Specification:
Recoverin, domain 1, 76 residues, monomeric, mainly alpha, 58% helix, 4 helices, two-stranded antiparallel sheet, muscle protein
Length: 76
């Protein structure tokens, strides 16, 4: 009925290109790489606040469910 399709499909396109697992999880350094490709500078305060509050699935490996909730609200 009412959903955001243009920005969600562009976040998934950069995520699947920079893949650690395949279509599910990307690495801790690849979170900063995808943010530069879309339109957001990964600063020391932004990177610290995102991996510490929004957890890493394994050791340093962020997944798309918690990633898409924090990335759509901050860089909209």
């Amino acid at each position: 009925a009412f959903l955001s399709e243009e920005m969600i499909a562009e976040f998934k396109a950069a995520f699947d290109m920079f893949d650690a697992d395949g279509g599910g999880d990307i690495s801790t350094k690849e979170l900063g790489t995808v943010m530069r490709m879309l339109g957001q500078n990964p600063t020391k305060e932004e990177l610290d606040a995102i991996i510490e509050e929004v957890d890493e699935d394994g050791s340093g490996t962020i997944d798309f469910e918690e990633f898409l909730v924090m990335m759509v609200r901050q860089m909209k």
